[PDB]
């Protein structure tokens, strides 16, 4: 018997391609709903740290497209974790895998309905691991999600994480920062 997950999750991959449109580089890799199928995927796909500059992975609840425009994300936001260029060889894959296990294993308590999915952006200037939630104004819920994320990933206080609306005249401040 495979161990069933609370819901179905889809893995997406975007390969950087200066030729074509952003939305056309986005491919859904697989959908899974058991722990065993999660691992069969994870074990055979390339490590985040191995990706070429401009590539991303997304892990989103089935039926949520990993875009700002999707109805599930339109009023939402993200906890953002920047990974120092210098420390990425030791933190990038660890951060990403811990976040995936925390989400599929439903580790966000009574707040799991607010989680849309996770994103890793692999970049030259520095990688980013993010957790997308469906409502940017649910401050209590968002703060709590952030505290658990920080804990799961063992992010120290010297490295703030921030919650921001999905990105006119003014640079938008983050809604929440930890440590505050």
């Amino acid at each position: 018997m495979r161990h069933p997950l609370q819901c179905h999750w889809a893995l997406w991959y975007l390969k950087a391609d200066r030729s074509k449109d952003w939305e056309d580089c986005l491919k859904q890799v697989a959908v899974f709903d058991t722990v065993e199928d999660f691992w069969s995927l994870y074990n055979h796909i390339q490590a985040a740290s191995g990706l070429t500059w401009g590539s991303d992975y997304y892990l989103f609840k089935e039926g949520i497209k990993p875009m700002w425009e999707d109805e599930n994300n339109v009023k939402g936001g993200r906890w953002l974790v920047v990974v120092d260029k210098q420390k990425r060889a030791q933190l990038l894959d660890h951060y990403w895998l811990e976040l995936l296990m925390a989400i599929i294993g439903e580790q966000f308590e009574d707040n799991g309905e607010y989680i849309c999915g996770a994103v890793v952006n692999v970049r030259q200037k520095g990688d980013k691991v993010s957790l997308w939630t469906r409502d940017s104004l649910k401050d209590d819920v968002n703060l709590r999600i952030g505290q658990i994320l920080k804990a799961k990933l063992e992010i120290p206080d010297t490295e703030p994480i921030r919650y921001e609306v999905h990105k006119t005249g003014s640079m938008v401040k983050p809604r929440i920062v930890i440590p505050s």
Binding site: V35, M101, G105, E106, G112, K152
Partner: peptide, 13 residues
């Protein structure tokens, strides 16, 4: 709810 902690997810791998 179905909940798996990291230790458990590991032993399945």
């Amino acid at each position: 709810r179905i909940i798996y902690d990291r230790k458990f997810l590991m032993e399945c791998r």
